[PDB]
Design a protein around this ligand. Sequence first.
Ligand SMILES: [Ca+2]
Length: 223
Amino acid sequence: IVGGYTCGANTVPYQVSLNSGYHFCGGSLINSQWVVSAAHCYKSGIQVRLGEDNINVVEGNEQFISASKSIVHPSYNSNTLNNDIMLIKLKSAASLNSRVASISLPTSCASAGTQCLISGWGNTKSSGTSYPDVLKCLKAPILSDSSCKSAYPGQITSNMFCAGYLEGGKDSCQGDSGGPVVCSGKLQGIVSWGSGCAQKNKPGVYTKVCNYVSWIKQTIASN
Ligand SMILES: [Ca+2]
């Protein structure tokens, strides 16, 4: 997260870190046995880490559970990042509490102008590199599709939405991918891509989760 603030330990209970020997992506816990993340974060040997704040220090609220199965969206296109969403099933259910909790899926799409909370352990600089050890947060509004498509001509599909600031300075970034974008207590987006981080007129592009609620529910129910 660039230009954000330190969330605080366990203040974002649905935030998970995907670890394959190191943190490589974020994700959101939707129920005790399922995690949603970005399809571009796919890889084998994923261990899900919940209840994390400092990902390099065992502070006592963590739950490390390996994935039993990963399901990348049927129509995921790695070249365009269209349908950048993936589901991960845990080998065993997580113990839910005030520090480790699931996030509700939306029943309707959120409108432009809605303020959301984006979080992750990604790079904190628009130029250069600096990865934090504790969870970073950012409040940003959903941008209109018009400004979103003007910012990224020929690249924004109906399954994407922009959130952030056209002025730049604040945005999600490398390492934040797969993370949550929560608005009104509902998971509305997944950190997907953007041109660099926090650049002027290059806001973050997020997977529009409301378009995938049926696929998520049906997959969970049969797996
Ligand atoms: Ca820790």
